[PDB]
C-alpha cells in the first residue's frame, strides 16, 4: 500500500474533505472517462461508501483510501501526467479544430453499389480517439454505427497470426505489395496473393481461422476477439449488408474459384463456405468510438488500452502494422505511407482505421468516398494532421520543424527550452548558443524573471556571449527587465568594465 | 549547473583528479575523445595541464577552467541522460553480434570489375554512432571502400533540401514497383519509380545545382558529404570510376532513355549527368564516417558530432520513408517486414542502416547476397531486432524477449503563472523545495517575488521552508515581497 | 455422253465385271459410300440381283446406273480433282505416319479419369479432301472427345448467323502475346480471342439468345452434323461430368466477365458454363473431324454432300484466327514453322486445315509441354518439311517439295460477238475445230449464227472446217446464215 | 514455232507494223523496258533500219528476232500470265486509287525537317506481278525514304546466307502484343521479332560478319538492286544524319542489347547502329518498291529478270513475319481483316505482297495514329473488299469478289454453261448442288436457252419439275429459234413436259 494520502492532499488542496463533485470533474479533464473497466472498483466502492454518510458528496481521507487501493496504480499516472499525452483538453481542442477544417470537404460520391451503403447520409463526420492509456475524446456523428467493410481485413490477419504464427500464416499469403500496376492480378509468382490487405489475400486469411469447425463456431471465435480488442464495446453485425454483399458478390466469386484450383487454401477446405464467411466478416458494423479502442489496441502492442488483456501477440501486431503501412489503404497506400507515413486501412463504408503506434489509435468516418476508394473528410483529416503534428512515422522527435509534440507537456515544454537558451550564458559557453541559434530559435524569449540572454550574459561579465548576442543575433541593446535594470544598469550593479566596454558603443 | 558537482562526481570528495581517470571515465559514456564539440575542453586541458608542478592532477577551481566551455553537453553525458545511457553493455552486445555474424562465409564477391574484386571475402566492418554523439566501432571498420548505390538517398535528400519535396517529385516517383514489374525503368506519368534505383538516382543527379559544370556540382556534393560525416573521411576512387563507366552499358541506356521522354530539366546534358552519377557512385568512405552520416539522418538533419543543421527535416523525412520500402534490392519488401528499419544497400558489400532518433549504423561484408545485398551484413541486420526493439512498428512498452537500450525548470514556472498543483506533483519524488534559479530564490522566495499567497501557504504548511536567507539581488523573502 | 465414260472403263470389251469398277473407283480417292454417289450405288446394288448372278454389267443398264450422279464421276475418273495422284500421295502419307509414331514420349492427359483411360499407345490419322478423297490409317474410327478442338467451329457458327461485327463487339481477334497471357481479358472490355477459354465462353453466349440449353445443343449438333456429313458426331456424358467438377479455373474465368458486363443482356452464367462443358465433350472419330476440316478448306460448303453450311465470310475469320491464335502458346511458332490454321484438343487431337485444298485430323493422346499432342505435331512439322503446303510457301519454286496440285465452251463463248484470237490459242492444245456441244455444232455453226466474216474466212480454208454437218434443229452452217438474215455468210455458197 | 506468233498479230496479212506489235505488247501489262526483252528490242531496232521504211516486218525477220525471247512472249500473249485481263484490272486499280485519294487526313512525319518536306497531297500506287505485269498511277516515280519497310529484307538476306536456325538464335519469331509492347526483350533475352526496331538492330549485326560499315552498305545495295531489277535504289544522307540526331531511342535499345549478350561474338555497338540508320534512310520509288515486293511473291526469283536472288525459305519466313508481326500493332487487325503480308514505313509507304501473284507499293506521307499510312491503308482495305486475295479467302465458292487469276468475262460463261450440261445427261444432284450455292438457274448460253429449254428438249421431268416449282424458272420467254419451252417439248415430242408446262400457264 502506497501513501494514497498523497493523492488526497493532491485533490483536497486545502480544506479537510474532498467533494466528489470535483474528483471526477478533474478525472475526466485528464482525458480518461468514467466507463473505464479499470476504474470500476474506484467507482463501485465510491458509490458503496458514499451512501454511508450524512450526504453522499464529501469524503474522509480514510474513505478515499478505502476507495482506490486497487485502482491507484492508474490514477497515479492520471494526475501525475504520466498519461502518454499529458495535456489533453487543449490537444483535444486542437483535434476539434481539425475536425472542423476536414469536415467542410463537400466532395465524394457515396458507395452506392448496394443500398445499405447508399443510405448513409453524406454529411456524417465521425471522429473518435483512444490513447494507449485509455484517455479518449471524440467529436461529430461518432455514435452512428456502420458496416466496417475492408477495414476488418487487418484484424483478420492479426488474429490468424496471434493463433497460428507468422510462419504458418505467410505460407499462404505474400508479405509485399504490388503497386499501381500489377494491381489487376490475383496472385504472385509464388502462386499466392500479395498481402492480407487485398481482397484475395483477406479471403486466403479467412480460410485459416479455426480449421476443423463451421461458420457459426468461427463467427463467434472472431466476435470474441473483436469484443476483447474494443473493450467489449459495440461489436455488431448487419445481415442486410451481408446479403447485399453476397448477391452482388461479384469478382470475389471468381477469385474464390481460381484460388480453389491453385491449392491456395489449406488441405481439405471448401471454397463456397469460406467465401460466405468472408462476406459475413466484411458485413460487421461498429461505431467510431468502438473502433478507436481497437486501433489503440494495436498501438499499445496488442494489450488493450481500457482493460489490460493479452489480446494479440505483439508479433501479429507488428506484422499487421507494417503491412498497413505499405499495403494499407488501397492504391493510395504508397503515397500515404510516404506523405502521411501512418499505418492505416480504409473501408468502402467511409471509415479509416488509423494507428499511431505507442501513442494512440483513432477512427474517422465519412461515407462519401473519393475516386481512389478512400474517404474525403477522412484523408483531408489524415494529412491536415501530420502537417500540424510530428506523428509522421519517420519524422524527428528531437528537432522537428514548427509542429507540435504533445508527448511532452504543453506549458512546461515552452520553458524547458527557453531556459536551455539562457544557461549557455552563465558559465561562458557559446557552443550551445550557436547550436541553438543554428536551430532557428527566436533569440529574445524571456525567462521567469523577464531577462533575455543579454541581461544575464551582461550580469555575469562575459564578453563573448554579448559579442554573440548584440552583433551576431541583433538582440536589443536597450532592453529592460522585471527589476528595471538594463544591461548597463547591471554591468554597473555588479562591476564589469569589459562588458560596459560593449554596452557604451552600441548606443 | 554548478560545474562543481561534476568535479565531485569524479573526484569523490577529494580535490585531486588524475585526468587519467576523467578521460577514462568520459570514454565510459561511449563518447570518444575526438568530439568537435569538445574542442575547448580538450585543448584547454593540455593548455592548463602544463601550468602545474606536474601535469597529471587537477583541483576544482583549475578544473572549472577547462569544462566551462562545453558543460552543457558534459553534464548530460555524465548524468546518463544521453539517448542511450547504458552504452557499454549494449556495445558488448554489438560485439557479440559481430562475432556470431562472421561465420556467415558463403556469398559470391562483387567481381564484375577488378576494383570490387580486390576486396577480400574476410572483411566485416561494423560502425555505430548515436544521435547524441555516442560512438563505437568494431571489425575491419577503417578500411575504405567505394560507396556505390548507398549514395542514392543522400543526393536525393540534398536535392530535396535545396528544392523542396514538390519540385523534386515532379521528376521522380514515390512508390516501389514490386518484385517484378521491376525491369520497366519508368512509370505511367513520365517519371521513374523512386530515387532508390539507378533511373531515379540519375533523374535526381540531374537536379543538383542546375546551371554549372560537372565538377563544381561535385564540390557542392562533397561539401554536404563532409558535413554529414562530421568532416571525417570523404574519399574518391577514380579507379572504380572509369571501370564503372567502361562496363555500365545498361546505365547508359536507362540514363539516355529519359532524354527522349523529356524526363530531365530544361537545358540538361545527358552523358555529363551520367558521368556525375558515376562520380558519386565511386566515392570512397569507411564504416565509421558512414555511420556518422546515418546518424546524421537519425537525428533529423542535425549531425551528432558537430552541431550543424545539415538538411531540412523535410528531406530527411522523405528520404527515410523511401528507404523503408525501396531501400534494399528487391529484398526490401521482406526487409521492411522482418526488420522494419530504413536501409540502403551498396554493391561494395556495405549496408547503411538507420534507427530514427536513436542511432545510425553501417555494416560491410564485400561478399554480396544472391539478390544484391550484403551477406554477413544482412545476417547482422536481422540479428539486431532479434535482440532489440528497433523495428519501426514494434512496441516500446510490451516487447517480449527483446531489449530496449533507450532507457528546477518545473519549480518556478509553476509558481509564476499561479498554480501550486505542479508543486504538489513533486511529492511523488520526495523533493526538498530548495531548488533555485540563478537569482538564488527557493520555492518560497519566488512566492514572495511574484506575490502569490497560495504558494507561500502550501509550502509553509505541509512542506516547510526557511524564510530567512537571502537572494542574489540582496532582498530576502520579506524584503522582496513588499518591494513591488 | 456416258458412252465416253463406259468405253473409258471397259476399254476393250462390252461388259464390265464388278471386280474392276469398284477396285478402280477408289484409286482416285473417293470412298464407295459417298452421299453424292447414293443414287448410283443404290442403282448398282439394285441390278446386282436382277440377273442370274451379279458379276457382269453391259452398257445397257450401266447407262442408266451412272446417269443419276454423272457429273461427279466425270470430274473424278478423269483426275480433274484437286488432288489427282492419290495412291502415291497416300503411299507417302503413310511413309510419314511411320515417322510420326516414332517419338514415344509424352504425358497423357490424366487430369480426369476419362482421358487417362485412353491408352498411351493410341495413334490415328485421317484425311479428307474437298473432292471427297478420303484416306486414313491407324486407330482412326475410334471416337474420342472433341476437347478444345471444338472451339473454332463454334466461333464460325455464331458468325455465320450473327455476323463478324456483332460477334466481335464482345470478343477480341488479336492474340494476348507471349506473356500478358493468363490475364484472361483485354485492356478494353472484351477477352482476347475465341481460341481461348474466355473468348470461347463469350462465344457460347451468342448461340441462340433466348432458348434452352438442349435447344441450343441440338442447333450446334445440326451445324456440326452438316459439316461432318452426318457421320459419327456424338456426345460424352461421362467426360462431361468430369471436366465440370475439375475445371474450377473455367468457373472463375467465366464469372469474372459477369462483373464486367462482357456478356449480352441477361445471360445466365452457370447455364452457359454447363453448355460449354457439354460442347467440349463430344465423341467423334478422326475421319468425322477431317470432314469438318475439309468443310472449312472448301469455304463452308461441305465436300461429301454439297451444302452451304457456313458463310465463307465466317470461314475466313475462323481460319485466320486459327493461324495466329489457333494452337496454345505454341501458336506463334506454329504459324511460323507449319503455317497452317489448326487447333489442338488435350484429348490428343489436332485439327489441321489446308485452305482450298483439304482437311485432316491427327490423334495421339500423349500430350507435351504446351498442351498439344506429341506424334501429331511431329507429323505436322514433317509435312511442310516435305511438301509446299505452308500458307506462305511458293507454288512455282520450292527447293525439293512435291506439289500434287498438278473444252467446247471455248468456241461457243468465243463465237458470240467475235474474238478470233482464242480460236488461234486452241492450236497449242491440238483441238480439232469440229468440236460440238450436244447440239452437234462446230465453230462454223455459231460463227454463221451470229454473223462474222473473218471467222469463216480464217476457219474454212486454214482449218478445214465443214459447212455440211447437221445439228439437232436441222439448220446447217449456211442455213443459219439467211434463216435469221445475214447476206455475207450466205461465202458458204462459194465453199461448195 | 515462232511462226505462229506472227500470224497471231498480223491477222493473216502480209507484214507486221511495229506500230501494232509494241502497242499490243503493252496491253499485256508488260512494258518495253523489261530486261528479259532486250534481245527482242535491240534486234527489232537493229533490223527496222534494214528496210526502205522502218515500220513493217515480214515473218522471217520477226521470227528470227523473237526466237530468243519467245518462251516468255508465249505465256505473255497466251494470256497465261497469272493475271490474264490486265487492262480492265488496272482500270479497277485506278478507281481504287481515286477512291482512297479522297482522304485529306492524317499528319506528316514531322519529327524531322526532312520528312516534313513531303507534301500531304502526295499519293502514289505501283504494281508489279510475278510475271512482270506492271502498272502504276499517282505520284509513283517520286523517291522517298524507305524507313521501317526495310526491316524484312535484311532478315531474308540473313536467312538467305547462313540459314534460319543460326539467325533465330538472336531474334524471336513471334509477335509481342498490344501491351508488353515497349519491352525490348523476350523471356529468352532476345527481341520479339525483326519487325521492331530492336529486332532489326539485332539483324543488322548479322549482315556480313567480318567487314566494315561501308562494305556492308555495298553488300546490301547489291541485293536491293537485284530484287528491284536494277530500278531506283538510292540513298539520302541528310535524312540519315537528321534521324540520327533526333532519333536516339535506338541508342538505349543498342546499349541494353550490348549488356545482355544480344549481339554475335565480337560485335561493335555504335557502328552497327549507324549501319541500321544508313539502311533505314534509303531512297526508293513506288515502282522499284513494287518490284521488290513482288520479288517475294515469286519465291525469291526476281519478276523482271529471272534470277534466284534470295533463298525461298527466307522468303517464306519473311512473309509469315509480315503477316503476324508486320505493320505496327495494327498487325493483328491487319492480318485478320486483310490477311496480306505487309510492312509499314514512317515515310508514308507500305510494302505489300500477294504470294504467287504480285507485289505493290502505296505511298502517302500523311500517317495514321497507329504509325501506318492513311490512304495507304484505306486503299489496302478497299482492295480485299473487292478481291479474293485475303490469304484465307475462298477460291471456289467466294462471294461477289473478283479473281483475276481467271478472266472476268470467263467467270460467267464457264459456269453459266456448266449449269446446263447436267440437264442433258439427266442428273439433278448437280442442280441441287448448284442451286443450293445460289447459282442463277435463269443463266442463258449463247443460244439464249436456260435449263428449262435443255431439259424440255431432252425431257427429264426430275429436272424440269425441279426447275418449275423448286426454282421458279420462266416457262414463257424466247430462245434463238423463238421456240419457247412449250415449243421445244413440242418439237422433240413429250406430252408430260407439256403436261407440267400447262400448269404454269
Ligand atoms: O527481361 C526481360 C525478359 C526476361 C528475361 C529473363 C528472365 C525473365 C524475363 N524483358 C525485358 N527486360 N528489360 C526490358 C526493358 C524495359 S521495358 C521498356 C521501358 C519502358 N518504357 N515505357 C514504360 N512505361 C510507360 O508507361 C510508357 C508510356 C508513356 C506514356 C504513355 C503510355 C505509356 S516502361 S524488357
Amino acid at each position: 500500500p502506497s501513501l494514497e494520502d498523497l493523492l488526497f492532499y493532491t485533490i483536497a488542496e486545502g480544506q479537510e474533505k474532498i467533494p466528489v463533485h470535483k474528483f471526477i470533474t478533474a478525472l475526466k479533464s485528464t482525458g480518461l472517462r468514467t466507463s473505464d473497466p479499470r476504474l470500476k472498483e474506484c467507482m463501485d466502492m465510491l458509490r458503496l461508501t458514499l451512501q454511508t454518510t450524512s450526504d453522499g458528496v464529501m469524503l474522509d481521507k480514510d474513505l478515499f483510501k478505502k476507495c482506490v487501493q486497487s485502482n491507484i496504480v492508474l490514477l497515479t499516472q492520471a494526475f501525475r501526467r504520466k498519461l502518454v499525452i499529458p495535456d489533453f483538453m487543449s490537444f483535444t481542442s486542437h483535434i476539434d479544430e481539425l475536425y472542423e477544417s476536414a469536415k467542410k470537404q463537400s466532395g465524394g460520391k457515396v458507395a452506392d453499389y448496394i443500398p445499405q451503403l447508399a443510405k448513409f447520409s453524406p454529411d456524417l463526420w465521425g471522429v473518435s480517439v483512444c490513447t494507449v492509456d485509455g484517455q479518449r475524446h471524440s467529436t461529430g456523428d461518432t455514435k452512428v454505427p456502420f458496416c466496417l467493410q475492408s477495414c476488418v481485413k487487418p484484424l483478420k490477419y492479426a488474429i490468424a497470426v496471434n493463433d497460428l504464427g507468422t510462419e504458418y500464416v505467410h505460407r499462404y499469403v505474400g508479405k509485399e505489395p504490388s503497386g499501381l500496376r500489377f494491381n489487376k492480378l490475383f496472385l504472385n509468382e509464388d502462386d499466392k496473393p500479395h498481402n492480407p490487405m487485398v481482397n484475395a489475400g483477406a479471403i486466403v486469411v479467412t480460410s485459416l481461422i479455426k480449421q476443423g469447425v463451421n461458420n457459426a463456431e468461427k463467427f463467434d471465435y472472431v466476435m470474441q476477439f473483436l469484443n476483447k480488442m474494443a473493450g467489449n464495446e459495440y461489436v455488431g453485425f448487419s445481415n442486410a449488408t451481408f446479403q447485399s454483399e453476397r448477391e452482388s458478390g461479384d469478382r470475389n466469386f471468381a477469385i474464390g474459384y481460381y484460388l480453389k484450383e491453385k491449392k491456395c487454401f489449406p488441405e481439405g477446405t471448401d471454397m463456397v463456405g469460406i467465401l460466405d464467411f468472408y462476406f459475413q466478416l466484411c458485413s460487421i458494423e461498429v461505431t467510431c468510438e468502438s473502433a478507436s479502442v481497437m486501433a489503440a489496441t494495436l498501438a499499445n502492442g496488442g494489450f488493450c488500452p481500457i482493460t489490460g488483456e493479452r489480446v494479440l501477440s505483439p508479433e501479429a501486431v507488428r506484422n499487421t502494422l507494417s503491412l498497413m503501412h505499405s499495403c494499407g489503404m488501397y492504391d493510395f497506400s504508397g503515397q500515404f505511407a510516404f506523405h502521411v507515413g501512418l499505418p492505416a486501412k480504409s473501408g468502402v463504408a467511409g471509415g479509416i482505421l488509423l494507428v499511431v503506434p505507442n501513442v494512440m489509435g483513432m477512427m474517422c468516418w465519412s461515407p462519401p468516398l473519393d475516386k481512389m476508394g478512400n474517404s474525403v473528410k477522412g484523408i483531408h483529416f489524415c494529412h491536415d494532421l501530420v502537417s500540424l503534428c510530428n506523428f509522421h512515422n519517420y519524422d524527428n522527435l528531437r528537432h522537428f520543424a514548427k509542429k507540435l509534440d504533445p508527448r511532452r507537456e504543453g506549458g512546461d515544454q515552452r520553458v524547458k527550452s527557453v531556459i536551455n537558451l539562457l544557461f549557455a550564458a552563465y558559465t561562458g559557453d557559446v557552443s550551445a548558443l550557436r547550436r541553438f541559434a543554428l536551430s532557428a530559435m527566436d533569440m529574445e524569449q524571456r525567462d521567469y524573471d523577464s531577462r533575455t540572454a543579454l541581461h544575464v550574459a551582461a550580469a555575469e561579465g562575459h564578453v563573448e556571449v554579448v559579442k554573440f548576442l548584440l552583433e551576431a543575433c541583433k538582440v536589443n541593446p536597450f532592453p529592460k527587465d522585471r527589476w528595471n535594470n538594463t544591461p548597463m544598469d547591471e554591468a554597473l550593479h555588479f562591476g564589469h568594465h569589459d562588458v560596459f566596454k560593449i554596452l557604451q558603443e552600441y548606443q
Side-chain angles (χ1 to χ4, degrees), chain A residues 25-85:
Chain A
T25 313
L27 180 66
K28 280 205 241 68
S29 72
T30 74
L32 261 164
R33 247 130 61 174
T34 308
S35 310
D36 268 67
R38 304 166 301 180
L39 304 195
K40 187 198 190 301
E41 288 74 347
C42 188
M43 288 294 173
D44 277 6
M45 291 299 300
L46 195 290
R47 307 147 178 162
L48 172 51
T49 59
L50 188 59
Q51 195 65 320
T52 71
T53 168
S54 63
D55 61 335
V57 47
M58 307 309 169
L59 268 176
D60 300 357
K61 201 225 85 183
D62 267 59
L63 287 169
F64 204 122
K65 238 171 170 172
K66 271 36 147 179
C67 283
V68 295
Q69 55 195 16
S70 54
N71 312 131
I72 187 66
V73 183
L74 167 53
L75 281 158
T76 303
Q77 160 182 103
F79 289 96
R80 297 288 130 167
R81 307 286 278 267
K82 297 180 187 290
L83 293 173
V84 173
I85 296 180

Side-chain angles (χ1 to χ4, degrees), chain A residues 370-391:
Chain A
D370 191 62
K371 48 212 172 67
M372 284 303 308
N374 302 317
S375 187
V376 168
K377 157 181 164 296
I379 283 179
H380 187 297
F381 194 79
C382 277
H383 206 321
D384 206 330
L385 182 80
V386 293
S387 290
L388 202 78
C389 298
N390 70 319
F391 293 114

Side-chain angles (χ1 to χ4, degrees), chain A residues 66-346:
Chain A
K66 271 36 147 179
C67 283
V68 295
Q69 55 195 16
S70 54
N71 312 131
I72 187 66
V73 183
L74 167 53
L75 281 158
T76 303
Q77 160 182 103
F79 289 96
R80 297 288 130 167
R81 307 286 278 267
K82 297 180 187 290
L83 293 173
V84 173
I85 296 180
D87 187 311
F88 214 77
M89 292 265 287
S90 63
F91 152 68
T92 55
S93 286
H94 268 307
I95 280 186
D96 293 1
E97 213 172 8
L98 288 189
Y99 154 97
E100 189 68 4
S101 290
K103 181 204 72 174
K104 296 156 175 171
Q105 214 66 6
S106 305
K109 189 169 185 176
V110 194
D112 68 332
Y113 84 107
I114 42 169
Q116 297 83 352
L117 303 173
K119 296 169 186 186
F120 301 134
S121 184
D123 308 334
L124 297 174
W125 345 283
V127 180
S128 295
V129 192
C130 173
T131 325
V132 296
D133 282 9
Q135 53 202 142
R136 292 150 89 180
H137 173 91
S138 307
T139 299
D141 300 330
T142 68
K143 309 294 174 178
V144 185
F146 65 85
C147 308
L148 275 175
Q149 300 290 13
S150 309
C151 295
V152 300
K153 296 170 180 172
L155 316 192
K156 280 198 188 67
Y157 173 58
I159 297 159
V161 179
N162 183 27
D163 294 317
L164 298 168
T166 293
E167 208 275 351
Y168 178 92
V169 172
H170 272 289
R171 217 178 308 169
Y172 295 109
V173 298
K175 339 191 181 192
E176 325 184 15
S178 54
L180 277 161
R181 289 165 167 174
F182 256 62
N183 171 251
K184 280 53 170 169
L185 297 220
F186 302 153
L187 302 188
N188 187 27
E189 189 234 23
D190 50 17
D191 292 356
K192 44 172 173 172
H194 306 330
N195 57 78
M197 221 52 46
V198 300
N199 296 74
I203 290 167
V204 180
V205 169
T206 299
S207 75
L208 307 157
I209 299 164
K210 265 298 195 185
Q211 289 172 203
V213 301
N214 53 91
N215 292 8
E217 186 166 344
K218 297 197 289 179
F219 195 4
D220 65 59
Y221 194 101
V222 163
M223 300 298 263
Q224 183 201 55
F225 276 59
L226 276 85
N227 273 309
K228 290 174 179 169
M229 296 164 50
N232 307 92
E233 299 197 14
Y234 186 28
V235 180
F237 182 75
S238 192
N239 195 272
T241 321
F242 165 72
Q243 286 189 356
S244 263
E245 274 277 15
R246 186 171 47 185
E247 175 157 27
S248 192
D250 296 322
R251 56 188 302 170
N252 295 303
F253 176 103
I255 303 173
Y257 257 110
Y258 187 85
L259 290 159
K260 184 200 173 191
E261 184 168 273
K262 287 285 178 61
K263 281 74 170 178
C264 295
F265 300 121
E267 187 183 333
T269 307
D270 168 74
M271 196 289 281
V272 188
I274 304 294
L275 185 60
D276 283 59
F277 185 20
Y278 169 94
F279 287 116
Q280 289 191 259
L281 298 170
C282 287
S283 311
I284 289 171
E285 60 174 89
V286 305
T287 177
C288 314
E289 303 281 8
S290 50
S292 305
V293 182
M294 317 179 95
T297 307
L298 296 164
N300 196 97
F303 299 174
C304 162
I306 48 172
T307 67
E309 267 186 317
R310 201 212 73 87
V311 194
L312 303 152
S313 181
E315 177 185 26
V317 183
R318 175 160 47 88
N319 298 171
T320 298
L321 274 165
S322 57
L323 309 200
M324 292 171 64
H325 184 61
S326 49
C327 323
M329 42 190 300
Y330 298 152
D331 294 356
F332 212 120
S333 60
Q335 287 199 0
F336 193 73
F338 170 90
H339 235 245
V340 187
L342 313 181
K345 174 53 174 180
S346 186

